[PDB]
Structure 1
Amino acid sequence: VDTCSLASPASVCRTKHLHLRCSVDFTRRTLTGTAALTVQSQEDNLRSLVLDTKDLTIEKVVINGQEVKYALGERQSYKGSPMEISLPIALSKNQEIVIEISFETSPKSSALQWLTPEQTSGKEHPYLFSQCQAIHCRAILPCQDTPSVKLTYTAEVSVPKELVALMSAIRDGETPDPEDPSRKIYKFIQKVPIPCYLIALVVGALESRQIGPRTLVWSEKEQVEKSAYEFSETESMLKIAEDLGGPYVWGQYDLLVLPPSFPYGGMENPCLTFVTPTLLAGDKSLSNVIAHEISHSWTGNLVTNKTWDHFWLNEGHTVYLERHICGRLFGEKFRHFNALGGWGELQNSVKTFGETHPFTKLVVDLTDIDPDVAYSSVPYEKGFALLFYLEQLLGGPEIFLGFLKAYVEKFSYKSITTDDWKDFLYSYFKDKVDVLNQVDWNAWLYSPGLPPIKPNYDMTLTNACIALSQRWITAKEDDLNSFNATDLKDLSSHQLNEFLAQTLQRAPLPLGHIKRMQEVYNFNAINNSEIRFRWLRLCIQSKWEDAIPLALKMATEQGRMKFTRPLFKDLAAFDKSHDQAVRTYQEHKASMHPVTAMLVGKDLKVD
């Protein structure tokens, strides 16, 4: 049962295809058009069905060329409103019909951000982008908004002719719009069945540059060169991913670099991964995010969580493949370094929610929970920990990668639950079932807090970070003189980040120590978003007022929730900045991404 969806479930009927014809109206901030769903009955004598919607205006529903009766139920908060549609003729099992729904989105669609020209790089044109995962596709169009259903799609999108439309699909040409020559229609086809959370649309003043045999980078003109360099490892990462996962089935793997309000690091939209511009560090140092989105082309997009309770299936396996990709490129020691870091992120999350909190469970129960409220590192790192522990239990990376590849093959084009996964794990490792029966499954899958067992991690690259962090924490005032820029000499950006993360775990430090850290290390000058984030957090938690404007500026000039939410929370927790934090949020709220607005709102207890 999908407790996040109000649509008829896959046992009742299944959408096989969507043909989307819509027009993007920047003057009204609406998407208007028709969603033609090819729906297959799974039942005898089916006479109605239910679709998810959220803030949609339905004009009509047409089947067999005639308008039919439909009703919208009462709004169930973050789930939207159920749309019941009366079929004109009763369907037998496996019969397919086409249901054409005429609709319009609300300007408040939780799926969309509409950007004015001033909020873009070029300042001459507006921009639109979507984010459907988890349950925001219903805020674009009526659908069975559950990852238990997989469908192909085609689309025709009319935009002002100066602008470019892209989607999670193969581009299939453009033409002037016959109805209005100030506009273009862009066409798209996605021939691989996908869950509807992978439907994506961007419209903006976009340009492309080729960076590999199957990859174009897309962004506004002013980010293209920087982006092409930053993500130049992409093809080499696809080749490793193919080796680990089997053939890449999606044709193209393009990248879109979004404006700074993009709420996440990446979104694995098929054919067209969306990424944050906060990745543009200048040195390819945050490319693990690319490895991650690439890996979803197998774990997530081919094998998909059946409901959101099983999201760890998506993330855990994708983090596991991500860290193998980075392991191949940069060495096994580095894979271990990143793995150990991820454990520290898991410790942070468990400490934030609390060690008995239901959101710290691997398999969560989202009955009456807004998935955006539950989202965190837990599914990622507790998932990864589980798999890393099993790798060590079952004979090492090369054995467990055999299982990962067999798993992808087994469940390609399907949606699956934690039990499906466990079942296949046991099947595959039948000769090691006694090892498998020593796993505390109930604890790992269903209990809150840190996992019951911590894997083994190589420490080589981590040691220098911990040693410096510990020097700083145990320092007294008379030790501060001994710190010097040479401390950082043999530390990569990755180790600087980890040094900061270690230190942040014991924050606050004395204000005098933090001021000295700036004095000798000049962290204020570093524009790597991961480093700068953790450094400003350490400054604000250690009560340095000079960091207030730096933290406010970072929180607002970009909108990646990973950074924007804790910066605002920290600024609110600090009495000197508390009022500015609330004021800044209230002043930016209308121009923020709707999900980010909502969550920063709850975090600050404002409204």
Structure 2
Amino acid sequence: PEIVDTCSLASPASVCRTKHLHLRCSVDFTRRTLTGTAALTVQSQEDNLRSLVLDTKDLTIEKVVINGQEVKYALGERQSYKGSPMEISLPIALSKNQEIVIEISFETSPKSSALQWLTPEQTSGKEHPYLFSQCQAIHCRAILPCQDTPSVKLTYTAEVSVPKELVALMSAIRDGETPDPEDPSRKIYKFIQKVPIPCYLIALVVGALESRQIGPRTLVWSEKEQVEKSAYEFSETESMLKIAEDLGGPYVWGQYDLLVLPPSFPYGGMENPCLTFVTPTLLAGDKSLSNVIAHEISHSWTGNLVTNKTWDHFWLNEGHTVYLERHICGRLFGEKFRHFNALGGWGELQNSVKTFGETHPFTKLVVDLTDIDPDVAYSSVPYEKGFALLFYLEQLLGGPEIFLGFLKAYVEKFSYKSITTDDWKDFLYSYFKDKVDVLNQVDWNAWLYSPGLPPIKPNYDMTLTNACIALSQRWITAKEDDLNSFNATDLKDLSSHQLNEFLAQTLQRAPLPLGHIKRMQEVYNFNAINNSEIRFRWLRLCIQSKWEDAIPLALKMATEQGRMKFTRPLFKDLAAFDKSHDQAVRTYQEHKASMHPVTAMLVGKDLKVD
């Protein structure tokens, strides 16, 4: 039953397993390098083990020490985005289950694909630099040598030396701070993660960070300028944790802290254990974007406890998390709201499938990422096709109470483990043994392995959606003589979420006539809305509908923050508009060197540069 990880060049788990990492490192802002030692505790899974291989990417290796002596190693040739395999020659052959410690001395490259280094001028405070990591999926190898596969789980401890005026945090419990004895201009911050994790959950931030308590087990961390606003925005965090624990079982990670990154953070959120990272584009002022928090919270079970064995099975992580997320929002705001969010997600799945094309391999639920960069394959598919399968199964099997019973048992069953789609399906069948006939009605081959929209669409309550659709249809069907009829009162009874969904519905039929879009600004003043989700869709609608006045607005939003969800389509839309095309390419070229490395790579590909 061989399931090897085709995104990793390291020895697989059937050969050896990393049990622990002790990281001692220093963050050198002058050189943009992290230097140090990664001591890996490795357990052989084989008799007579004499060598092993680790993943690396743009790492400089100084030496490898085992039993107090330097040992032989070799770096193989680079394999594109996978990096370079590092083979280490063990000094003494190991027995099955024998453990040794391998201490590797390394330095990262300034171009590390895991890291973004920000100058003082790129930060809020303008006086100090800043560093943040993003390891998921396969970027941990760009920080340190490791078996860079989610099929292996390890604990870790870390000591990190930084300039003394700065603060380091990690995906771990804080374990104190001291002056660095080898350099009094520096401080050492210490961390312990006692729960076994996949290495993609390793995370580091260094900057001028302050904190505020917002719940019994939560501090919010940011630069001083963002602390007050972040505390309010995310004040529902503890209530969401309590609901998540009801649904998933005990929260095992101790603290649930939040870090609000600078605007170039590439994602909305990342579920780094003990310390979720979020985008500052969540700071709407009204908590309207807090489903992202419910999402990250939910990953403390689906993803962080039960983990995809390889990235081909990423839907397990994401589909289940979206499912749990939408129940948290449903508990807080009602079942009609859960159905509204669910139906929105279907619409986003439509968009993604239309974008890739209905036969495209990246629209399958289970994907084959052999020679595919996970960053290139990344999309809403695993989120929303995954969620749709689960919601479909929920409806098939007797409803949300019953299906939540399965979700909790699933988490319990696979906690601290890494699993495949077949492990999930096998457990679903075991749990629901008395409804196997119902299960055998699902077209498993199509749902799991075929491209395109799923073979069946679930049932959705339409209550909160109907007004959005009605208003969108009024606009699309409007002729010039109907434009006068529209007025600000049209929006009176729409929540921000419904305004967003109005825009999403309308954007699905873009372009609209330019005069329509001008009238929309005239009566609805969407240019004034700072909500990032809303503004994003409004500017897309304006650019796709060829409104030249929106060009500087779209360029501004694309560059002043860097969440790929917003930055990628805005740049792509600006490139497809002949009036803005040359400026879109120029702007990307001018900014590229100060962008996040992954964002830079993907925008370049989108724009067909280099």
Q: TM-score range by the shorter chain?
A: over 0.9
Q: Secondary structure at the match of 2:84?
A: coil
TM-superposed deviation, 1:227: 0.1
* Residue number among 42, 56, 65 corresponding to 1:53 in the alignment: 56
> How much has 1:36 moved relative to structure 2?
0.1
Partner of 1:515: 518
In 2: Cα distance, 1:276 partner to 1:330 partner = 23
Shift of 1:535: 0.2
Paired-residue identity, % = 100
Distance 1:125 1:259 in 2: 13
Verify: 1:415 aligned to 2:418, yes or no: yes
Partners in 2 of 1:209 and 1:250 — Cα distance?
19
In the alignment, which of 39, 43, 47 is matched to residue 42 of structure 2? 39
Q: Deviations over 1:286-339 (max 9, x none)?
A: 000000000000000000000000000000000000000000000000000000
Question: Per-residue deviation at 1:276?
Answer: 0.1
Figure out how many residues of one structure are paired with residues of the other and give that number: 607
| Secondary structure of the structure 2 residue equivalent to 1:284 | coil
Unaligned runs of 5+ in 1: none
In structure 2, C-alpha distance between the alignment counterparts of 1:548 and 1:357, rounded to whole Å: 31
Distance (Å, rounded) in 2 between the aligned partners of 1:561 and 1:401: 32
What's 1:229 paired with? 232
Instruction: Give the Å deviation of 1:257.
Output: 0.0
Secondary structure (helix, strand or coil) at the match of 1:156 reads: strand
Per-residue Cα deviation, 1:40-88 (whole angstroms, up to 9, x for no partner):
0000000000000000000000000000000000000000000000000
Pairwise CA distance, 1:515: 0.2
- SS in structure 1 of the partner of residue 254 of structure 2: coil
CA distance in 2, matches of 1:234, 1:304: 23
Q: CA deviation at 1:278?
A: 0.2
Q: Distance in 2 between matches of 1:330 and 1:260?
A: 29
Q: What is the deviation of 1:215?
A: 0.1
Counterpart of 1:261 in 2: which secondary structure?
coil
Between the aligned partners of 1:364 and 1:477, the Cα distance in structure 2 is: 47
Structure 1 position 186 matched with structure 2 position 181: no
Cα deviation per residue 1:245-265 (whole Å; 9 max; x = unaligned)? 000000000000000000000
Question: Cα RMSD between the aligned structures?
Answer: 0.2
Aligned-partner SS, 2:548? coil
State how far apart, in whole Å, the 1-side matches of 2:238 and 2:601 are.
37
TM-score in terms of structure 2 length: 0.99
Which residue pairs with 1:565 in the alignment?
568
Deviation at 1:489, TM superposition (A): 0.1
Q: Secondary structure at the match of 1:4?
A: coil
Deviation at 1:443, TM superposition (A): 0.2
Task: Please say if 1:154 is aligned against 2:173.
Answer: no
Query: How far is 1:279 from its partner?
Result: 0.2
- Is 1:129 aligned to residue 129 of structure 2? no
**Pairwise CA distance, 1:491:** 0.2
Show CA shifts across 1:202-237 (max 9, x none).
Answer: 000000000000000000000000000000000000
Query: How far apart in 2 are the matches of 1:557 and 1:348?
Result: 25
1:396 Cα deviation after fit = 0.1
SS in 1 for 2:39: strand
The residue that corresponds to 1:505 in the other structure is 508
SS of residue paired to 1:228 = helix
Post-superposition Cα deviations, 1:558-599, rounded to whole Å, max 9, x if no partner, equal 000000000000000000000000000000000000000000
Question: Deviations along 1:479-520, whole A, 9 cap, x unmatched?
Answer: 000000000000000000000000000000000000000000
In structure 2, C-alpha distance between the alignment counterparts of 1:580 and 1:40, rounded to whole Å? 55
Work out which of the residue numbers 423, 427, 438 in structure 2 matches 1:424.
Answer: 427
Q: State the SS of the aligned residue for 1:107.
A: coil
Deviation track 1:507-536 (CA, whole Å, cap 9, x = no partner) reads 000000000000000000000000000000
Secondary structure at the residue paired with 2:131?
strand
* SS of corresponding position for 1:52: strand
Q: d(CA) in 1 for partners of 2:218 and 2:52? A: 40
Q: CA deviation at 1:272?
A: 0.1
Residue-by-residue CA offset, 1:16-58 (whole Å, 9 max, x unaligned):
0000000000000000000000000000000000000000000
Query: What is the rounded CA distance, in whole Å, between the counterparts of 1:345 and 1:219 in structure 2?
Result: 31
Tell me, what secondary structure is at the counterpart of 2:38? strand
1:161 shift after superposition: 0.2
How many angstroms apart in 1 are the aligned matches of 2:365 and 2:11?
Answer: 27
1:14 deviation in Å?
0.1
Q: Provide, for residues 359-395 of structure 1, a one-character-per-residue CA deviation record: whole Å limited to 9, x for no partner.
A: 0000000000000000000000000000000000000
| 1:184 CA displacement | 0.1
Partner of 1:524: 527
Give every structure 1 segment of 4 or more consecutive aligned residues whose post-TM-superposition deviation is greater than 3 Å: none
- Alpha-carbon offset, residue 142 of structure 1: 0.1
State how far apart, in whole Å, the 1-side matches of 2:340 and 2:591 are: 38
Question: For the residues of structure 2 that align with 1:376 and 1:294, how far apart are their CA atoms?
Answer: 21
| Residue 318 (structure 1) aligns with | 321
Distance, in Å, in 2 between the alignment partners of 1:537 and 1:3 is 37
CA apart distance, 1:408: 0.1
Distance in structure 2 (CA, Å) of the matches to 1:570 and 1:583: 15
Please give the secondary structure, in 2, of the residue aligned with 1:442: helix
Structure-1 residue corresponding to 2:251: 248
Task: Give 1:269 shift.
Answer: 0.1
Per-residue CA deviation, residues 123-166 of structure 1 (Å, 9 max, x unaligned), is 00000000000000000000000000000000000000000000
CA offset digits 1:98-143 (Å, max 9, x no partner): 0000000000000000000000000000000000000000000000
SS in 1 for 2:56: coil
Say which SS state the counterpart of residue 154 (structure 1) adopts: strand
Secondary structure of the corresponding residue to residue 184 of structure 2? strand
Secondary structure of residue in 2 paired with 1:210: strand
**1:347 and 1:588 mapped to 2: Cα distance?**
32
User: 2:441: which partner in 1?
Assistant: 438
2-structure distance, mates of 1:174, 1:226? 27
Q: 1:22 aligns with which of 16, 25, 45?
A: 25
1:546: Cα distance to partner? 0.2
